């Protein structure tokens, strides 16, 4: 017997599919950076795509621990081009803030149903979103200071390209 | 400048998106096995999904190494249910044979255009397809001899659950 | 001076005595499994009884950290017989879900009194209950698949008998 | 088949439940010492409670080794307050002597029925009772010489707090 | 863009400056203990002052992670004299309970604004306050038992002087 | 009994409170650099704040070693903004020179009273002031040659960010 409501399971299943798309979106930003010849930025996006997949698998395993199951949905085509390095990272920031709000909505839904197990499970993602948003804001701050100077952009490519 | 033809670049890009779907499909088989309580089969499918992503990334890096670009397309919703363990693996074998034929078509297209670089690049996937088809046929052979006997299915669940 | 209300201290003290009974109940399930000759199942219940005691001691130490004290109450006689292996584990699942709801009630009580210290303390038990319930559901799932086949039941006895 | 008489099995089962109460009683002395702020005495009582559980489990495994069954009974509420450290240890000594007499009664019952296996099994508890009574008498002797001097009680709190 | 409200940023910034004062206050208690010749008590207060600074830096880093900034305010002169060892530690306890309530107020403010990121961030401080208050209550309990006996006070000076 | 004059004790106590402000001021420069996104400069200022606290504690222990007492005074609100990286370091140099002159005044006061112990104690701070002034002048010299070029400022941010 499923011990989460179907309304909470659907919210969790929806967020899992959102994490899959986020991973797909970051891979598509990698295709853009690789097309532009920035292999450090592309490498950063490829690792970010891997991290989003581990987010989805965390939702995956919790759903089965509460007696639910996962249904994978179609993944819509992400954008493949941006008007520059900062335009892509600004799109990344806007996306992460959207993901954070989507997590907030599940937390409030589970809270009103007094599903404390799901409320507590989501705490890790609330904290992780703070990290993810901040990491993009820091990059955007460095790009603003670079102001297109390729000497500085080359260093940030090699630096972000060292992400493990 | 791109040194692969647009017809070969499109064929390679199509196969990348096909490998992405293949990984997605195997994750959906994992969701089915986990729903049925077979965590060894589900683990095998999760590792199979990871292996398909590496195939997709190998097409990715070859496309850029030939001066082309990757465009990610929408991913279709895979089925989420199968009529038992054997039915799922029968679907996996039929799928792998479809992937092998899709690789053959790129090889023949590249060979017609005298694109020897792409022809030689595709040899690794031809050999890998031989291995992945045999892996599923071996599993299917043991399931046929098992004839649904749960004593045997349990041993094969935990064995497949040991895949690294 | 006690910095938890007497109403929250009583709720915590009641839960401590509930954990003691749960440990006693699991020991009594061990006496049943040992009487039936399943020393792996009995071993699993003996370790589960030890784990419930560490739960009680966690409530014990928090009560004294908030300036309260513990009063041990009488422990009612647990049942000593079940109608089979699955009947016992189903009784275990129903008990764990009852314990989870009892934890939920303390969390809601402490929340209305705005006792955030107790609310946060209970998060560990909310998460632990997810683990405990899931572990029993997994065992019940394997017993359903076993369908009384002693070849399979022997393996699950030796497997659960390896719990450390 | 059971190779101990029902009269010896009942006597052994009664002692198991008595050992369970003894462990419960020592936990209640821990709750008293912790309420009084003596964390070394409380630690000693917590370790003493763990040792009594091992005694109970030794009766447990002997009963099943003779083909009998264990039935857990209700546990009485122990006292939760004592008139100081010395009063608690005086209650502990009186309790241990009661446990020793209860062991003697089983030994004499088993010896009357010529149950040499149970007679020999009980020798370990006779010797252990000599040790546990002496441990409490030694503590009581130092408390009498201490005459309530807090300088001495502090040193004996931290010494007893080092029990492993 | 700051993603915390200015009302939450101000509350967090106010608490940071409160932690700075708490560190200053504990250093001033050290000046009192050193003036009284108790170098173990003073050492304990100096380490407590260091721990309060790490609390302030935790608020510091979270504010910048949410897009806010820190503004340091003037630090009011703390008291420099107490009427005895217990009077100082009782002042420490009253201060820690005041800090805990100030943390509670931020948690409730962030909760009403549905700022779950800040709510979750404050959980660490809620738990830490339980530790801090308890550590002072334990010391006050030992001082009450000492009742001014310098033989016992000397040991608690050397003991607290060993805090690492 | 105090073996330093009250006029030297007050001068030493005044300098302790000045060192406390100096550490507070450098923390405020850290809040400014972090607000501007320069985490290497901010890290350097945080380490500089820690070093000033050790200076304050050295005055602390000398005052008690001469039989005096420390009285902590209110700490003024430092400025929280500067007109860029260079402006902040220019303020730091002007501040360090003020600290050096304040040390000189104590040395001359102690020398007038023939307090050779305090004169000799202050030699360490005279030499240390030479080092801290030179550290800021060296940074200012590189900032002048940098002339705002962000390629150079980035390298000096990460270099100063490596200070331990
Ligand atoms: C150099 C590192 C490259 C990492 C590439 C990662 C690309 C992931 C793109 C998203 C794919 C989504 C659909 C498939 C999901 C499969 C999940 C498997 C989990 C075990
Ligand atoms: C082989 C492992 C056997 C473990 C047996 C554990 C049995 C526990 C049964 C419950 C007892 C409850 C009453 C006594 C509680 C004592 C708690 C001591 C805590 C330090
Ligand atoms: C023997 C250990 C002595 C430790 C003394 C600590 C004294 C701290 C007193 C409070 C100071 C507040 C104002 C300055 C804050 C600087 C914070 C720097 C953080 C990196």
Structure commentary:
This is part of a larger assembly, with 6 copies of chain A (164 residues). By secondary structure, chain A is mainly alpha-helical. The first copy, chain A, has one domain (1-164). Chain A is built from 6 helices and no strands. In chain A, helix 1 packs antiparallel against helix 3 (85-112). Chains in contact: A-B, A-C, A-E, A-F, B-C, C-D, C-E, D-E, E-F. Chain E binds chain F through residues 24, 27-28, 31, 34-35, 46, 60, 64, 69-78, 80, and chain F through 24, 27-28, 31, 34-35, 57, 60, 64, 69-78, 80. The complex binds eicosane (LFA) (3 copies). One eicosane (LFA) sits between chains C (20, 23-24, 27, 46, 49-50, 53, 57) and D (20, 23-24, 27, 46, 49-50, 53, 57). One eicosane sits between chains E (20, 23-24, 27, 46, 49-50, 53, 57) and F (20, 23-24, 27, 46, 49-50, 53, 57).
